[PDB]
Ligand SMILES: COC(=O)C1(NC(=O)N[C@]2(C)CC[C@]3(C)CC[C@]4(C)C5=CC=C6C(=CC(=O)C(O)=C6C)[C@]5(C)CC[C@@]4(C)[C@@H]3C2)COC1
């Protein structure tokens with residue numbers, strides 16, 4: 044892919060299902076000025092992914108406190124994303140979301156981020172931390188069966204922000 | 216770039232390491248087939264963040280031993296530099312005695328193979344790789360230079376890969 048630490052994270056423009064349940068075309072560059080956690084999950088209607096998606100959504104306030112936008116993405120269609128959002132949580136659905144979920148049906152965003160499982164046309168569990176200038180700071184990629192930690196993601200975002208100010212601080 | 220791909224054999228290496236007994240030995244990643252491996256890079260010796268990571272992994276080596284998991288650190292520094300850092304007491308800003316080997320990558324080819332060489336500086340990013348007992352790469356972590364890694368998170372991941380291996384074997 045083209046995701047390189049210290050270089051601008053690859054831009055994308057893609058249809059997402061938004062927290063209000065409607066579809067909107069969004070770009071990574073829309074979020075310049077905020078930190079971004081951009082994470083891929085393989086497919087809708089799966090069993091490791093909902094734990095991750097619901098945790099990032101449930102804890103979106105903690106990322107807001109860090110001026111950090113969270114965005115999920117999968118190769119499944121935005122229609123499929125919304126079907127999973129609208130599925131009752133009691134039956135395995137996501138329920139209402141506090142984060143947008145991007146659709147990557149052409150697989151080009153996953154390829155740009157180096158996380159396409161090429162023999163299977165779905166993304167690995169890639170997670171990318173992008174700073175407020177659009178520069179990639181952190182790459183995380185898990186094989187399909189192993190999920191990610193919101194605690195660890197928050198630790199990383201906060202630590203990048205703190206070290207960002209190392210040298211900018213009042214010298215009293 | 217690099218050749219580290221999830222689900223493919225992790226790039227082999229053969230390099231001089233400082234072993235836990237304080238002596239030089241040439242080792243290869245393939246020496247550790249049959250064990251999980253946590254293989255991690257740090258930018259250079261005699262720094263500020265890197266020793267806290269290395270000492271944490273060394274101090275907690277027994278927790279990885281209980282998971283049948285070998286931990287190996289690496290940087291582009293010479294093997295003499297590694298040994299000098301080990302021979303410097305923790306009291307005085309060194310590593311002190313180590314429970315893990317420290318690989319020397321002076322030709323930068325291991326860092327290049329793992330896609331973590333920060334070109335134009337000749338040092339590696341904070342790359343961490345989880346390799347299963349068959350030598351297959353399962354997890355990629357790369358941090359920009361200022362932010363360190365978590366041993367807790369690394370153990371969570373190793374445990375989770377071993378957990379899912381119990382039903383995710385390709386062969387019964
Ligand atoms: C960019 O514009 C500006 O900064 C303006 N000031 C300005 O240039 N000051 C100058 C001349 C330039 C900048 C520096 C060299 C650097 C920061 C500075 C040491 C410093 C840092 C940290 C504080 C401080 C005092 C507090 O009471 C405090 O709460 C905080 C948190 C002080 C101790 C006040 C002086 C200070 C601001 C000087 C002084 C121009 O109109 C505002």
Ligand SMILES: COC(=O)C1(NC(=O)N[C@]2(C)CC[C@]3(C)CC[C@]4(C)C5=CC=C6C(=CC(=O)C(O)=C6C)[C@]5(C)CC[C@@]4(C)[C@@H]3C2)COC1
Pocket residue numbers: 385386387
């Ligand atoms: C498949 O080959 C065979 O079973 C033959 N038996 C054979 O080698 N038995 C022996 C000698 C004894 C049985 C064991 C110890 C156990 C299973 C085994 C590790 C293993 C398990 C799971 C696969 C495997 C390779 C694949 O390509 C695959 O799709 C699947 C799903 C392999 C990795 C091939 C070797 C394997 C079969 C060995 C090898 C009959 O022709 C050879």
